[PDB]
Amino acid sequence: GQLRLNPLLIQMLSRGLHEQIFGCGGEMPDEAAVQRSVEHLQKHGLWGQPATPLPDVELRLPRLFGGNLDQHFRLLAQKQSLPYLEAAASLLEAQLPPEPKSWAWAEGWTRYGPEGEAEPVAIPEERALVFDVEVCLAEGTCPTLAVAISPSAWYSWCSRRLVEERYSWTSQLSPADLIPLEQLVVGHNVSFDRAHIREQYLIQDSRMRFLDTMSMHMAISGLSSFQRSLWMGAKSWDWMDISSANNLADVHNLYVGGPPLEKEPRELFVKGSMRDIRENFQDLMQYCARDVWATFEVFQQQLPLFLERCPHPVTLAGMLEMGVSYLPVNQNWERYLTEAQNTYEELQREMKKSLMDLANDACQLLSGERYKEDPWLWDLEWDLQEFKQKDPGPPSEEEELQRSVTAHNRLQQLRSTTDLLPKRPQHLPGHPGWYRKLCPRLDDPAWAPGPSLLSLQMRVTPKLMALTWDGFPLHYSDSHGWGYLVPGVTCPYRAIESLYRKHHHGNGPYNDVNIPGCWFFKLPHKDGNNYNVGSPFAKDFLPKMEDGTLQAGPGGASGPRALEINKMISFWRNAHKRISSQMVVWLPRSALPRVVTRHPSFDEEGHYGAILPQVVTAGTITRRAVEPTWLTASNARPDRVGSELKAMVQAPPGYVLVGADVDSQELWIAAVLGDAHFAGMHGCTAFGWMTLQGRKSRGTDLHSKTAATVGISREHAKIFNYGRIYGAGQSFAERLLMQFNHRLTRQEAAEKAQQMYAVGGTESEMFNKLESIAMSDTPRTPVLGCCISRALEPSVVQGEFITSRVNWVVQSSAVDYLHLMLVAMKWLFEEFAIDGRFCISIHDEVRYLVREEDRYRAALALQITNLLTRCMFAYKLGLNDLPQSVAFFSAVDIDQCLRKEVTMDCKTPSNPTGMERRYGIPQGEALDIYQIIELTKGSLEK
Amino acid sequence: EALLEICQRRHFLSGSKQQLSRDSLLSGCHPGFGPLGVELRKNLAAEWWTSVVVFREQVFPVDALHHKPGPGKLRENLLHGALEHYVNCLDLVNKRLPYGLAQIGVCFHPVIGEKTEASLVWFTPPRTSNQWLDFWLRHRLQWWRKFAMSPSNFSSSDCQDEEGRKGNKLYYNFPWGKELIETLWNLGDHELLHMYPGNVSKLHGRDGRKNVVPCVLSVNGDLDRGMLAYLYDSFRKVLKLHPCLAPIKVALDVGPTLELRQVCQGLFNELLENGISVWPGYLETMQSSLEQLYSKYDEMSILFTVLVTETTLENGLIHLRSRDTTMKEMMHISKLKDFLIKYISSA
Amino acid sequence: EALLEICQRRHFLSGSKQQLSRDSLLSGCHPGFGPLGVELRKNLAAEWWTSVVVFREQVFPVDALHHKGKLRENLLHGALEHYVNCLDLVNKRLPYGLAQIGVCFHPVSIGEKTEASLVWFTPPRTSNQWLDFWLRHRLQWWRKFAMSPSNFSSSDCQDEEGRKGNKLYYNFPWGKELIETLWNLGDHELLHMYPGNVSKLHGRDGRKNVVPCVLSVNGDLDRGMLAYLYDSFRKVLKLHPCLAPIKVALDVGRGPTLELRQVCQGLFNELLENGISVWPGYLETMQSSLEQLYSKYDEMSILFTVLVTETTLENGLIHLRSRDTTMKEMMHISKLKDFLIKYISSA
DNA sequence: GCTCCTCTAGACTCGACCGC
DNA sequence: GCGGTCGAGTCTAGAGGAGCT
Ligand SMILES: Nc1ccn([C@H]2C[C@H](O)[C@@H](COP(=O)(O)OP(=O)(O)OP(=O)(O)O)O2)c(=O)n1
Ligand SMILES: [Ca+2]
Ligand SMILES: [Ca+2]
How does it assemble (chain C)? Predict the structure, then answer.
């Protein structure tokens, strides 16, 4: 019988696989532990509920090296990181010849041997290299010059755009201009230095991995955001002497000490033109060499220290692998950028025209003095200036001419009245006071008809649009910022009273403003009540206007069409600079492999490039990767301009993108820690039981249960629960509930937050495990044993910044999970010759660019790696078993582009037609384990 | 409903109320367009001709007759006629691709009804067919949205033909529903190859240095339905037509009657010399309240309402009311022409 | 005779050179005009508008559908239907007029001719006076653009009903051809189309009411184009600037090509945005002989020719040539647009 | 448990010329 | 001689980053 059941009736791993991982026999369950788990479960009412067992699985897993799973990983990581740690050790000890006093001027690489003699070469021809490359930002993005050191000599590189002065070079990039180059490349923030290497962008992987000294620094002695802010403002306080910021000078001071690093004051590479960099070559080259030597010294002082804080080789073997992220794009990226920019411009023009129409249609209230009744425009200026001053028959041939000239001369003599006009003309004195400011002066050479000077940031636009917060008209005051009036020139309180009837507790009934008949409640600013908002169109209010609280009040078409345009262009405004400046290197067809160039989907007129993200493999104390452009929570929303960028990462023809998303990896990590700490079996914690047996379809999981309990949207409850797991206090939940629900007051929010945090509870044995592993004298990750940052150890920062460390435990456990996944996937790819490579690790997602013929084998390998990773977590936590439900991926995606689902058509204002209509991208396949086994026959090998 | 009364009283389109049904207007058979509607159609044709033919170095006018002999029935589509002149107009462009033709005319659509047609039969090399089609869609939708008060009503839809040829259709979200007002079809070489049998070397264009058969493209636009769309979009009764589209720009009324008549006549001659079409308001024999006269003018979409009062014989200051603003100004009569040309020349 | 070769080769007319039949040209059954011919017809129609409907106070635009399975005999019957409708555009104040540019149908069986029909609903007392008035004004207008206004001729003819009529003519080289005709038709047509119901038939002419006696003035713009073309015709087609389709031509001399192309593009945009039609002759990669280039521009009735050379990079002076005087001169860039506008306006 | 810099736009102010 | 704009100047509020260019 393949079916197995732990004493808690959770369907554990199938017997056909459990013997191949945890071995036969096992250990008998303790009666006391089973009794405690049963009592805990029936205390929460979860005991006795049956779930239909999942169809059992049988597979032939590949042979596991070593005596068990932990030794198997260790062996995998050693056999992966040995050829690069050899180069790292070769580079740690080196007798580097003295720096060249004068650098060469030739193209390409030059070799500086003993005592500064110059020798030209084509490649650095060295395994290890400390590498720094400088770019002339003003000219473009092509690398200007680079200086590199190897344990034998010094090297330097000068590009054609610096050596040779010629006409304008092609704006579109190509591998023909980038830096030519088992290997290891060491640098500081090497992701920047990674994107300028020629061989990186080729699709077939060149076996070279990059070590970032900044990543090692953030793993060793990093600082949280609060600690970084305190450290910057100042420069229980000993952590400053042991930690520093990510700046190369500060890191060098921390890990080496002594003279400060040389920083260029002119900044020619950032601001100066190409001529300045040409003229100051002998100084900029020496600056680059000094930066290289500083990075080398920091690397020397870090690498032996790093390996004593991350002893498990899996961490390093994954960090080497997480640094080769590869996003392949095609010709649709340029068209996406164009279309997005054009649509953004058109929407901005439409919003401007709607604002101008709102202004024009509002002047009519001057007639009859009705403007005193408008709730919004009463406060403006409406006075006018005076223009001060200093049948008869047909006509015969002569009669027409004489009448015409009589009329002409009668008109012409009126030109003499120019004397009465003042020399300096007035500026529209018949229009109201507020309308004169918006109109450009007639004398101005840039005159445009109507109120051309109107824009969102002005103090009058939130008045023309009749913006309403909860149906209350907005109102601006100099001493309190933007706010709204709650009903109940004299302000037309009667009209405001009538308006709210058709459509209270707030940020304070300010009575120091005294708008008659109303109370001026301020807008809730994101920095608390102590601050005042200057614009109700700020990026912080987008959820509020999308929630229907901030509306354009009275319907007049233009009102809303504007507000909706502002909501629609709320994303591209913040990210157009970053997304449009991504470095794309269009591979020539002579460098494409035969698989792409001989495929029916290949286009002889298309360009296939490769965006290599500048990812920081350790971008926070928690070691998770940080990249603002790509690694963020985003999706192709139906009403967002340019939000389909991730859908633009299309695999080249003949290749597919076999990726999968892990289901609640952070939650399940918390659950497994809790159950390992409580009773030593899965589901012994109510949180773990709801994580395993919970159903999203049936609304039994934690998110849906919390949403039902506190009566909020599931999207709010998701952030609420993820914050609660991250150790956020009661005040954080009170703030979240206040922000999500404006009607809720402080007392109600506090009561609800306290009641929700009162749930010994459903997660107490999880929080105790998190705290007991963060208050220890050396907080280490419970799986791979990676150490905490030296700016957080309790010896140094006792009593403070606990929340950061309790969050760090879960987040670094997730990073260890990711590293295990990467190592196992690389091992499977190499052993079974699955032609593929790493693509991206966006948040919890893991994507691999696999060949078309091996999409199913890649899916089976991904399922196996997920199974092995979960089993390794259970093994390290001391469980020696795994539930069947979480033993595989729910669905492994096989699609042609990055996409949260294989069914999304990605309908956005940029591309209203959808993906398939224009780009030609068909829908993908979401395969569960059973379909994968049916298609693959259960064997990875061909 | 209420719009067709306004479009009738102000002589946008004439005829009895029974004839002005949505089916009649949309079908193409209707009694006729009145003088103000005629002028709105003329302004729309002028703007289209500017933005299409004027600011282009490779766009030429063409002439297609209203009749089509052989297989005797009147014409139904102008694109079928513009293709005949392709080989003739290559001499003007020295066979330089891309290049296209244009024409604004009347095409008869069986239901017999006719539609004021606009054509932009445009020839591109096959290499850039998709790019040119996308650019022309992005340009024509922008052009339609340019003069419109509510661009969101104008839309774009992608479609494939029976052969799967990529094409796009534009619509205006009329109160009753979407209606087609423009069709960009990538016909390919089918039409030209069928019309010109034998050797196809006559059709070759100089795509850079490569001789290649052109890939046609038609941007057929219904100017009658487009004008009706603008008349529905523009719609106190007002018609906020774009200042570059309004049929009559200034309503030169009159406030000693003979001297004021002479001044009005002089100003009327002055404005007309600069292309600012005027509506004589100094010929009525019925005194009216200024509010009633203004509400009569607003339905006509008159940009300004000049009033040459008696005092202009002393200091030369004339009242000037603007439609959109609703506020009047006193501008010297010598500076009137410059202000009007500046206001209507910004576009 | 050789003029027809110029029109087809320079893209004034359309069709093969072998089918250039004079009767087809004069009967409306010709294949159609070319681009330059279409623009020349548009210029004529615009000048006819400015002279008949723009600078008048009681003349308005109307249009009538081509069909009515047979089409309309003349543009007149649409105005007779608008009589009830347009009797509110002028506030019922008789007399009033209607003018239209639209296609009349002449079976040479189908034919297309566009007529500048003018109708004037004058009272019975002043019918002869206004007939003479329109006759004199039409003769003046047709003689204004003519290089030799003596060729244009008039005549007086009597019809079967005793209604005097005036017939205009152009002295074509082969003989005298009709180009316009005038008739004092009277109230018979209006009474027949509206039997009884005298309330609609009478309008406020003076204090009393009366039924107007219509006056028909009909001139063939399509034949006026031929008349003015024959008026113009070394090989040269001198034409008044108000009718010439394209007026100034840009060129490029020696290298360097990029900056010369840029300055020519700027000049072309500057000239266009000010309403001067320009022939983009700078796009052609190969510049032929200056003599043949100027001859080609002359055959298109291009008023001025601009030759921007490398000297313009040194001091800015360009070469400017007028077809009338065939004399070259130098001028800076900033003065060329002003000179073109002045030359267009002064003639 | 929550700030540092630079960089940009809107708003109110005082001091200064100039046309009446 | 006296009021009416007009141009620095500062303050406030928001927005990009917490690297390396
Ligand atoms: N307040 C929050 C909420 C989420 N995340 C992170 C944790 C997730 O692993 C990751 C992705 O979140 P998703 O909601 O997209 O993925 P889920 O699988 O968790 O969604 P669901 O449980 O509804 O299926 O974002 C975070 O850092 N802070
Ligand atoms: Ca670097
Ligand atoms: Ca997830």
Answer: Heterotrimer composed of a catalytic subunit and a homodimer of accessory subunits (POLG:POLG2).
